[PDB]
Every structure is written in C-alpha cells, then in structure tokens.
C-alpha cells in the first residue's frame, strides 16, 4: 500500500542543493504546493533561519510568519514552507531589504541582495502561450502566472517582465540568438552565458549549444536553459562564486586566501 500521496519528506532524501545537513535531523521542511516543482524549490524556513539565521527553533519560525513582515513577489505570505523558486524575490518590509534567489555555479542558492528598483520586476520565460477559451489569448509563465491579453507578436521562449506592484506584462524581451541565459540543473548548474546556436531536432528533446563567458562550450537540453534577458545586458547582477564557472583548484586558492584575512 500507498493509498494516497505523502505529506511528509524525510531528510537525507531531500535535494542536495538546498544545503541541509545529513542525519542530525530526521525530517526536512518539504515545500508546500505552489507555482514551482518541489525539486527546484527552497522552503522559506531554510532561507530565513539556516542562511539568514533569525530563528533557533521552529516555534519562532511560525511566530515570525504571523507578523506578516514578509512579502514574496509583492504579495503577503504567511506560509512557513513557501515554495520559492528561480528569480523569486523575497521582500522584508521591516528592514527594506530585497533578496532574490539565483544559482551559484557552485550549485548553492545565493543570498543576493538587490535594490528595490530591481525588485519591482522579474523576468519570466514563457512556458506556453495559449489561445484560450472564446478566442482570448493568454501567456503562461514558468511560475504559473497567466496574464490575459498579452503583446500580439510574442512567440515561445520569450521573456517577459512581470511586475509585482500591479501584475501584468510591463514590456517584454524578444527571444533571439546570443541572449543571456542561465543554465539551471544538470552538470551545467548555475553557469551563465550567451546562446550561439539552438539545434532543432523534430520529435522530443532539442538541444541548445551554449558558450559561457569564459569560452567553455557545452550543450544542454532546451528545458535546462532559462532565458534571463537580452544578450550582454544583465538585469540582475552576478552572484558569488563567479556564477560563471570556476575550477576546484582556483576555488581552493580563493578559500584559503580570503580566510584569516577578514576581520
């Protein structure tokens, strides 16, 4: 048996890149149902008390949430295990600090403060662009936000500045060659780079040849490429650890050099 879906998830069976411990706790937070899939999510708790360390109990975490000092995507949340994802902005209204989640090329979720100007909008790639019922068109973004009456020239894999004050499309950026991308998941996790060429194969799975800033060339599936804006025109800054790609030797040299040299 198995008479229905689990409402629990054990630790030491949760995805590595959330940066939880091994067996020292027997249960992981587990994301709630929401706009993103649970593998790629980062439960609010892990950000709040394991990275920003504002709680040393679970009792505190609930009490923090009930204050409602936390908006996520401009809207007022109170969920203890909110399923935030890629380019989801967290807005602390008590301190005026806006943090966004973007991958390190190490593969660890970055604590990446952004200005409240850049926390007005986020760039969301279209997943489907849908001729809906009664001939009204809609675009649907990756984060499951359906915006009606969208711009009437858009096509698949375009990005779309969604605004979080007022909802809706606030222009768009057209998908073209050489656009900035962050390649997410896989062995190419958290790398940034242009395009170069998108190879098309009829039937399932189309691969996109990416060249990164360093000049290392690799392919991944189209699914694993996320378009984050226009070529050589960032809209949010690079995170820690380069965010490009760095070798284990170089990384060791940074780790030893910076440590016992601060303070």
């Amino acid at each position: 048996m198995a008479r229905g879906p689990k409402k629990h998830l054990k630790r030491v069976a949760a995805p590595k890149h959330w940066m939880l411990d091994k067996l020292t706790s027997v249960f992981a937070p587990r994301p709630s149902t929401g706009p993103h899939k649970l593998r790629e999510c980062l439960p609010l708790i892990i950000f709040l008390r394991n990275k920003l360390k504002y709680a040393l109990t679970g009792d505190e975490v609930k009490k923090i949430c009930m204050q409602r000092f936390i908006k996520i995507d401009g809207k007022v949340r109170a969920d203890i295990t909110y399923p935030a994802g890629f380019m989801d902005v967290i807005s602390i209204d008590k301190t005026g600090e806006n943090f966004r989640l973007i991958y390190d090329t190490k593969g660890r979720f970055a604590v990446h403060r952004i200005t409240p100007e850049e926390a007005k909008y986020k760039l969301c790639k279209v997943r489907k662009i849908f001729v809906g019922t009664k001939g009204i068109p809609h675009l649907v973004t990756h984060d499951a936000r359906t915006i009606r009456y969208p711009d009437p020239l858009i096509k698949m894999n375009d990005t779309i500045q969604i605004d979080l004050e007022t909802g809706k499309i606030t222009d768009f950026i057209k998908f073209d060659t050489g656009n900035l991308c962050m390649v997410t998941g896989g062995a190419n996790l958290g790398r940034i780079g242009v395009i170069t060429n998108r190879e098309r194969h009829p039937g399932s799975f189309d691969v996109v040849h990416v060249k990164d800033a360093n000049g290392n060339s690799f392919a991944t599936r189209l699914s694993n490429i996320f378009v984050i804006g226009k070529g050589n025109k960032p809209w949010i800054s690079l995170p820690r650890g380069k965010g490009i790609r760095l070798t284990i030797a170089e990384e060791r040299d940074k780790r030893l050099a910076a440590k016992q040299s601060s303070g």
């Binding site: 009606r148 009456y149 711009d151 009437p152």
Partner: protein
C-alpha cells in the same frame, strides 16, 4: 436579518462585480489600440510580398 452590516456587505458584493466588468472592458479596449496600430507597420508587409512574387516569376 438585514442590518447595516448586511447592507454594506451586499454593496461590497455588487461593487466588486461592477469593478471586475469595467476592468475587462478597459484591458480589451487598450489591447485593441495596440493590435490596430501594429497593423500599419506589420501587416502592410504583405503587399510588398505579393508584388515581389510577380517580379521573380518574370524571369
């Protein structure tokens, strides 16, 4: 029982409904302008394409 709270709630229900109807109208109208203006630059391409097909066929 109808009481002042109940009346106020009844006015909130209709108000929201009224707000929602007018919202749909505005979005549709604004969208129509965008779609219509685009025509003049975008869709007029078609004349050029039909015409050139005859130049090409000549030789």
């Amino acid at each position: 029982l109808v009481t002042p709270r109940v009346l106020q709630h009844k006015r909130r229900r209709i108000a929201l409904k009224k707000q929602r109807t007018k919202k749909n109208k505005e979005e549709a109208a604004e969208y129509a302008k965008l779609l219509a203006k685009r025509m003049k630059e975008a869709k007029e391409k078609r004349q050029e394409q039909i015409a050139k097909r005859r130049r090409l066929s000549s030789l």
